[PDB]
Design a protein around this ligand. Sequence first.
Ligand SMILES: [Cl-]
Length: 309
Amino acid sequence: MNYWWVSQKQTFKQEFEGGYMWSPKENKNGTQSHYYNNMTLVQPGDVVFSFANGLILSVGIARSHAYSYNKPTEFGVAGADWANDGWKIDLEYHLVENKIRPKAHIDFIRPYLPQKYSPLQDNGNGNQAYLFSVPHELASKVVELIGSEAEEVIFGFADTTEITTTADAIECQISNDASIDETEKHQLVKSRRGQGIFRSRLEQVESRCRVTGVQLKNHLIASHIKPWAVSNNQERLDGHNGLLLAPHVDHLFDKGFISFEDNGEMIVSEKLNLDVLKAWSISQGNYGYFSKQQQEYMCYHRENVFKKL
DNA sequence: CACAG
Ligand SMILES: [Cl-]
């Protein structure tokens, strides 16, 4: 996942109200722009800080690649000098209550500014250009200054999108793989959604939500332990590579906010706000031993899915 | 160049 800084002093209200970013493809004289070319590098799930009137106003999530699109008519005189031939990105804005003024924090962030194409000068004044790459270390400082609301956009939210993209591509690969028969293809695709033979096989091993004890089939998700995306075709259909979980517990486990020790002890991520467990009446403690086959997968989950600092 | 200053 990549971080971006979009400078929107001229058109913030229009871009926010429309849920987009927009730049020309080229400078007015037809020359290439590093900044406009950055539009073609943004991936769905990338985090974009909106900078306008000296403040960071939004921690946004990109929801498209750049697509060819005309300059928004609603820019009017404020956009007069930009070429009509442009790039648009659908940007899911998340307004923040703590609107940080980066210039007021320049001593803190200066060491983390990139050598080339920095959104800020060393005195903390913004550079006049549209879209800048933000190194991960600079992004972590900005997130520290904004506070919880910035973390809430990223962890188990923005950073899940690239995982979904990867899984979508694998589903396409399976659908086109000549080495596997039609039934296999169907069962592998259905297992991604906790359906088909995977669910029936999991029901031979597990009978209830580990955490909430609910036994009712219509209130339980068939979750993989080792994620579907990184599982081989045998592991994708293995009844021992799963848990039946209530939907909120599936959410916490699938994203790595929680995991389990082999003896069933719940492990809570530093990235899980403990107010969530209080609000949903989920206790820390022991949720029963896992089988040796389940333990192999749960080891993968602890080492690769569980969120650690 | 140039969505900040
Ligand atoms: Cl296009």
